[PDB]
Amino acid sequence: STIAITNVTLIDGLGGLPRPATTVIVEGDRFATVGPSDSTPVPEGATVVDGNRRWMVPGYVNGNVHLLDAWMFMAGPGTIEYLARWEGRYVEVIEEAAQLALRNGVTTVFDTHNAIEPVLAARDRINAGISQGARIFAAGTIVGMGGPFSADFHFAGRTAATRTFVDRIDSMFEAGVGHQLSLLPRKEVRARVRDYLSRGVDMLKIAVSDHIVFTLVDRSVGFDRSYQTFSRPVLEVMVEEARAAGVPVLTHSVSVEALDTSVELGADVLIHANYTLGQEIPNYLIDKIVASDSWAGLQTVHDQHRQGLEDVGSWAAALAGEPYATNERNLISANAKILLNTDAGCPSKDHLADLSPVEREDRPWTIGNDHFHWTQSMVEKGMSPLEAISAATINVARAYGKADQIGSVETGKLADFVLLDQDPVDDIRNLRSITEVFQAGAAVDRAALPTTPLVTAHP
Amino acid sequence: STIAITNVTLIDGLGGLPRPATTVIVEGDRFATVGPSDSTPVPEGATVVDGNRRWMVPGYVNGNVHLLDAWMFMAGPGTIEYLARWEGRYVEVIEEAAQLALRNGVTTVFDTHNAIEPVLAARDRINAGISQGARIFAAGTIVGMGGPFSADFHFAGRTAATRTFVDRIDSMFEAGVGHQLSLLPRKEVRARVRDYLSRGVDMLKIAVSDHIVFTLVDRSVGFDRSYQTFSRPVLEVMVEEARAAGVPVLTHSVSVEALDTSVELGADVLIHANYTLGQEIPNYLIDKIVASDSWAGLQTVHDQHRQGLEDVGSWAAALAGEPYATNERNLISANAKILLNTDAGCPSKDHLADLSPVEREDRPWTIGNDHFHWTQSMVEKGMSPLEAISAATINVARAYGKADQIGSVETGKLADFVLLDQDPVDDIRNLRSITEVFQAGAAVDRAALPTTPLVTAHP
Amino acid sequence: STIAITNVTLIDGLGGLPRPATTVIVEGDRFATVGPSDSTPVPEGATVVDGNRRWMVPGYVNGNVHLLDAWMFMAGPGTIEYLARWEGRYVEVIEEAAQLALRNGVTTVFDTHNAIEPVLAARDRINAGISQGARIFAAGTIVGMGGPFSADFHFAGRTAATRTFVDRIDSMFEAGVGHQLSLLPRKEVRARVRDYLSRGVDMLKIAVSDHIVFTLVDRSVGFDRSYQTFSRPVLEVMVEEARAAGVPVLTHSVSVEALDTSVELGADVLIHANYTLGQEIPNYLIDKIVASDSWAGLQTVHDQHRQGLEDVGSWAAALAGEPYATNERNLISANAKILLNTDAGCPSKDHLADLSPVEREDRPWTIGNDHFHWTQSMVEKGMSPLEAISAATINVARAYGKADQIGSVETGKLADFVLLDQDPVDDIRNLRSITEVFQAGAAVDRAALPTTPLVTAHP
Amino acid sequence: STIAITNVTLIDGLGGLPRPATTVIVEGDRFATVGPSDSTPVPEGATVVDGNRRWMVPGYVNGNVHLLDAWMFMAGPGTIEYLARWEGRYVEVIEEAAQLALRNGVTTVFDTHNAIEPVLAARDRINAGISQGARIFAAGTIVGMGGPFSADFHFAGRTAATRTFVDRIDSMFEAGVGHQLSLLPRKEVRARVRDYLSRGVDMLKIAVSDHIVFTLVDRSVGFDRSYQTFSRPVLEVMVEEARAAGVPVLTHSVSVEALDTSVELGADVLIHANYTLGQEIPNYLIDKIVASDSWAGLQTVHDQHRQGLEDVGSWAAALAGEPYATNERNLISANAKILLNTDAGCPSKDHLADLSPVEREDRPWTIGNDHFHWTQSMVEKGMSPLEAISAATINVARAYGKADQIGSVETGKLADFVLLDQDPVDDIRNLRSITEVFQAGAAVDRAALPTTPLVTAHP
């Protein structure tokens, strides 16, 4: 169809004032003309879309989620069942999460940890309109990290499951890259980091620091025992390669140091720079990130979500309060360039059942809720009700080099948009009320989504 | 309807001399009339089917298996994934379990330990010929023996798998019966054995003594603790109820104590009969058994498999090794009334895979191979091949009281039998070489089984 | 020199009204003459005691304790270090606990589970006067149970400690009995049971039920499984052999059966009586105990300490409230027959530091404060102050057959007794105030006790 | 004093043609003269010692040892008992081991991981002649590794004992260092290092890669997973302070990086240099090392032990074979320095008892054979018993800057020397020939050692 959406009150999300009396046309995919005129106008064959009493915000863009849920895998009881159920139809399961986002208005997602052949499949099944879902740029595995049954993720179950299964699934995820590279000389690293890269992942996440946490973490004490995965020399050896392909660089930082190094490594996208596992980002580095110009994603929680979570002693609750949010504001109020990151996904129905109602009410990490929560809380961090959005908008997409394409709302750009019911401003939570989601200049049947309920099957 | 045989050389299945040049005829399941007159009638319209060069042996009746394969449950691992994928298809995974008894010749099966619902629904489905398999009378669960994920079975996996999942399944097996009742005053236990009987188990199997033996196993002091779950006045209570509902009473016994205990009640069948855990059976017993009217189940391993388990140190080898055989035989060579008992069921294609190729060839614990294994080994413990197949066929029937229904090939009994190229009387193992298999006056398509494959699907 | 005590108020604690203005006269230990008169005079050349405005109570006797901490163990952790450090000095740890017992006024103590080598020798040491301490009786191991580093106790550490140490330190306990005993023929048990009793244990405590409730560790839950360690022929096979040596048979029973069987052998002392684990003893059984001639050892906790533990949720908090306190009133309300049973001991210096001060204060299971607490709660359950007083003194002696020697100020009997400022009758907590402690005629120096501080030495 | 030990064939341990027909004068430690002459002659008034038929070597110095024997603490079981029992006598336990070193000829011992207060006390005591042991130098703990109940050491351990004893003991090592250093900025990592030396540990060791053999405990997959405890700037900052103090800095490296990072920094000693954890030092790195001028300690085994080890199931067996071994070979022959390195000490009598008799004879990690086994296996890998004999002496001396004090019988040097009844140059193995041992000029009574035995005391 060729469509005209009329009488929209438009948030470009660029940061400009919202403008009412705005009428947007779509050509093909592709936004066409943006102006009010009275209209613009309509080419008589153009499909009508009535935009009275609604808003257009650019289609939401999530910079961090895992289409197959690693927060659970990291979480981790229930990793084994969810992998064994759903094995071999994973690629359709990945497309499940991709839909839940889009259903909630996220047109495009960046996934930083997954199984590469199913997540590439998914990225291929979705773009070609074989499979309904959100546009996915595949991160691949995160380099230097082991499988779902390794450490880095839930470690027991190495002993509770058949060895042949436990390794089987790992090799899917780990591919030829990953954590054994610790030991070995960069020569062979260099070798195996482009054989991998040649696989078509959009991006590279270089795991600069350890993923061993729930495994080691202490039952009274909070965090400790951060480590550093790779040699400082070995670390450029993958940045050179990453630079060579044209994929940008994403980085796992978990400690004040290794964040520093990640900033010195010139990494395009910093994934959870706010979790420094410790002291707040030394008031030094903020003015290096800010100064040395690479984008910074923060992952957040409400106070109200936290207030509950320590009330129930969630132990994933420590991350919410405590030096971590008292640390982001500095970057916010220092105008660090900010990204939408909630490590996220679509968990097994049983793992929701274990959590307290307090805990799974409005859970940030659940892929439908995540971008709303994040946009709601960030303001709680001293952020105007805009930018907030984009925020999710341009800033995740400015930070990958997808900015010219997504999105949007501007002429000659992919037409991905969401229509709201109510003012996004003073109440940032209105992003939830969505009369329509358009993608690639196309309508989404939101009412019936997902296309095939799989991981939402109970019983 | 019709079908008959010519000039077959049959073992009457009572250990009577095989009479060659002999013939069966049979109309509409159960056998019509047998013996040659060197005219055995053909009343025309009749299936001319050749019996030369092959033998007529009654169908195998395996008096212990586990259609959900509970053996794999007391660990190894690989239960967690197994129960997860397959949950809600359970009836099918079992029926496939049942079929692989038919292919390898077992025409009838009693399941000592299962979940009542999908095993009864598997039986209720077969019995109606709604599906293919070996006739099941299904004890349901065992009384006093609880969750697949508790102790008794896969103890690790409370912590590896979510509580919802574990709690959901644990209830699937326990019924109203199970672990607790160790606690209940017995007259209220009376309620909950009885609620259980009315459900439709064809029999009742109480666990006189623990299953904790295998979680922990442990540490290679190759024996050392047993316990007992109920008090005798509860046993004598439990058997009373088992009597009036008309069901056979079966008994799990793992200690020198607890067999004398098991027999006194009047249990018809003693599963795990030879397993005394660190001890040879007392003559005082070898007498209590031989004199007092009860059947002993025995489970055994090859002499070329025995030293395989010992070699790779399989931690199953404690059973193969040491006092079980000298304890086995002393029941055979005291002339006890024994039974074909092998715990078994389909294992994870993976749980198979972790195993050594030694453990894999000749494996006792598969549903297909286990009777071939059993009859073979049992002669190696000093049986008479003709008599051991009595253990395979009539003996199991007479235990549960099924002799008038199944067993030996006599007149008026269910028409179930097997035709073999080589000779059982010469070599019992050559009960393997089958050409035709018939259950209920019906040929079985020997290639189709298991129809819908799940656990077997390779890869 | 013939201790002679004038003007006191004597609680005979046979229940009778305390008689003031009374002097009891001691001739070389073994009290000779209680008096009315006014005094029934002070023969001559006797030592001087000053009794007016003070109360003499019988020197308390303890119907269960653990000198080597058993309690703590079950625990769990803190056993690997405590038993490791004090190895071979064990024998002095025993007396040290009974150095702690005496100074608060416990003049006699019955230990149930302990290590014969240390437990018995220490008593031989104490009685003949080599070491200061409170008289010891000592069942040795509980036949039917293992030791500290197995199940029944601190399971863990098996895999965290040395196999050589592991095996060495149980089998200090286990002796000939406990693991094994379950396996063997009754015939071989009664040889081993007879053999062990030969070592002069004063008692036979047999574990009628299991001691593993702590693999039954669980939260969101409470205990479900209990087992009965031996068959009935073995349990009464033993009680024969205890009858041989003329020793009392004590029973360990945590199920509603089990306790019932304990009853059916006529066990002289029921240890753990009120603990049937999650069930309430039916009044048929409350009646079975009261009619059948045997004693109910009753373990207790503060209504406050319950309210104390219930808050910080001590992992032992479940026996404090719950069906376990609520019944036992049942046993006493019905004139049950009573005995002062407090599993108790002297924990490692650390074992206390791991405890919330709401548990380090007024702890029931610390051998110092152990009896004071038990009496205080027994009045709350519904005892007349004296009869709790009678039952913390003579009953326990009368249960085991010691009322020939200890427990009442009736003459002939051992001179154990205690003097306090305050009247226990109008507050039984005012038993707490000790002025003098006299054992076997002799005064106790309560200032320097324990003589050599070991476990009380910090650090 | 004037000690003169005469007509010995002297090896000053410089790698020359040995010096037969010699007499060396000791005047008050600190050798006065050396020349064959006839003697030189003797100054009388003097201890003339029989030098008949015997050699003189300066006596060994071990450049890697733990006097709490932390090779067991990863083992780990049997860590707890050891630390639990000896505590408070820890100071005597350290001195305990230093005597077995002196008993076997090690005249000076370098201690690379321990608790400060005990070891600096033990050190300071031996120097002060207030106790008898091999002189101590003692790096203190190794920075970046936490207590022995943490990762890097005994697991499980930590959850199987009190949290106080775990916390008290842990802290005692960590000294302010290890673990958290991970958490905190280079700027306050720096300051926290400055405080540490303040007590004067005599060198600095810093773990460039992690101690976690036992977060990976898979036979089969085996060795994978390595980490670095510090980013390069933190190693940098740590390194200079170590210079500002003038303590030799030593490196713990287990990856092909680390090692390549450790030479980059210029840690004098690289400990664990031949351990690539699964990879063989690259050419270019071995010829990087030789230019680099740092001293390489290699931990070596007999081929005799390695077959023995591997024929057990010995968990170190990998460490003997593979490149782990095949590496020292490629390092010795590049004309690269070698340092005498064995982590070693005295394990508890129970730690040894578990192992096969194969494993406990000639055990490299035991402070009795530790050097001997080591020395022999250098000549087995291509050293010259002239250069291997010294590899235990002048290198370890030269490595720490003690070179003008220890390692050769030479200019104004403390008299440490040991007298052999055999020729070491002929068979190295002949370093087991000792007759007497002289430390600081004085003889020590060698069957009198250890003076007080704690760990040794069997049983």
Side-chain angles (χ1 to χ4, degrees), chain A residues 227-410:
Chain A
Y227 275 122
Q228 212 111 332
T229 299
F230 288 110
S231 130
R232 159 186 280 289
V234 173
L235 228 36
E236 261 89 342
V237 156
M238 316 159 158
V239 167
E240 249 157 36
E241 254 51 52
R243 290 306 134 164
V247 314
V249 168
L250 280 62
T251 220
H252 198 252
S253 1
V254 266
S255 67
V256 168
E257 294 272 328
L259 205 146
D260 185 325
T261 314
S262 307
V263 181
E264 285 292 323
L265 286 153
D268 292 69
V269 159
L270 233 163
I271 300 290
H272 61 54
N274 86 281
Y275 304 140
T276 171
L277 285 215
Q279 317 67 350
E280 316 132 30
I281 294 176
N283 252 43
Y284 144 44
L285 219 65
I286 283 118
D287 268 276
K288 260 174 59 163
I289 292 133
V290 167
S292 286
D293 308 85
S294 54
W295 289 73
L298 300 75
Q299 335 215 355
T300 75
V301 193
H302 293 148
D303 291 336
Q304 285 187 356
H305 197 61
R306 99 169 203 169
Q307 163 57 314
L309 254 61
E310 351 175 285
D311 275 24
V312 281
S314 199
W315 271 335
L319 263 197
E322 306 219 271
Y324 310 138
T326 78
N327 163 24
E328 334 174 14
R329 290 152 178 140
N330 305 358
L331 292 162
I332 287 163
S333 38
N335 271 269
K337 306 166 306 312
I338 288 154
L339 202 80
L340 200 158
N341 290 349
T342 66
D343 263 328
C346 176
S348 60
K349 339 110 201 75
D350 286 11
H351 184 219
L352 307 194
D354 287 349
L355 305 179
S356 57
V358 178
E359 180 159 8
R360 76 173 167 279
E361 179 256 344
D362 201 332
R363 170 182 212 255
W365 307 276
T366 282
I367 209 164
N369 264 280
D370 63 330
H371 60 290
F372 295 122
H373 198 105
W374 195 91
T375 328
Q376 134 118 63
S377 84
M378 264 295 104
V379 182
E380 293 199 342
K381 259 84 212 143
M383 184 144 129
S384 183
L386 358 172
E387 280 54 4
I389 310 114
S390 92
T393 295
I394 46 152
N395 322 22
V396 212
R398 296 219 152 285
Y400 290 83
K402 299 283 141 30
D404 49 311
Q405 297 283 42
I406 38 167
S408 321
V409 157
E410 306 178 65

Side-chain angles (χ1 to χ4, degrees), chain D residues 5 8 49-50 52-60 99-107 367-373 375 389 416-424 427-439 442-447 449:
Chain D
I5 165 72
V8 286
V49 204
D50 168 313
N52 191 2
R53 188 195 310 152
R54 294 152 187 80
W55 281 238
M56 170 159 154
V57 297
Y60 318 141
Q99 293 172 333
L100 289 101
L102 196 78
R103 182 177 63 117
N104 304 130
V106 189
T107 54
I367 214 161
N369 303 294
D370 77 317
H371 38 283
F372 299 122
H373 169 122
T375 69
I389 204 107
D416 320 352
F417 56 95
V418 66
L419 291 78
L420 313 159
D421 270 20
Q422 302 171 329
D423 194 49
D427 192 340
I428 181 79
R429 189 159 99 185
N430 264 279
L431 292 115
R432 296 245 185 164
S433 40
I434 313 129
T435 30
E436 295 122 286
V437 174
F438 261 93
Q439 146 163 94
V444 302
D445 183 5
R446 263 217 300 100
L449 278 188

Side-chain angles (χ1 to χ4, degrees), chain B residues 163 179 182-186 210 216 219 223-225 227-229 231 234 256-257 260-261 279 284, chain C residues 151-152 155 158 163 179-180 183-186 188 210 212 219 224-228 231 256-257 277:
Chain B
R163 250 105 53 195
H179 232 39
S182 92
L183 302 168
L184 274 166
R186 82 186 83 99
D210 83 319
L216 84 171
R219 291 199 24 145
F223 52 118
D224 113 329
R225 161 167 34 201
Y227 288 114
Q228 271 177 226
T229 98
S231 66
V234 191
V256 183
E257 276 319 273
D260 174 80
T261 307
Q279 281 261 325
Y284 108 86
Chain C
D152 301 330
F155 189 77
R158 292 230 93 164
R163 177 141 46 211
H179 279 35
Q180 177 159 130
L183 330 175
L184 305 151
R186 64 219 66 275
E188 302 179 20
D210 66 308
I212 331 153
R219 55 134 172 44
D224 49 319
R225 77 184 58 67
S226 205
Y227 295 9
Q228 318 210 153
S231 31
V256 187
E257 308 293 299
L277 293 206

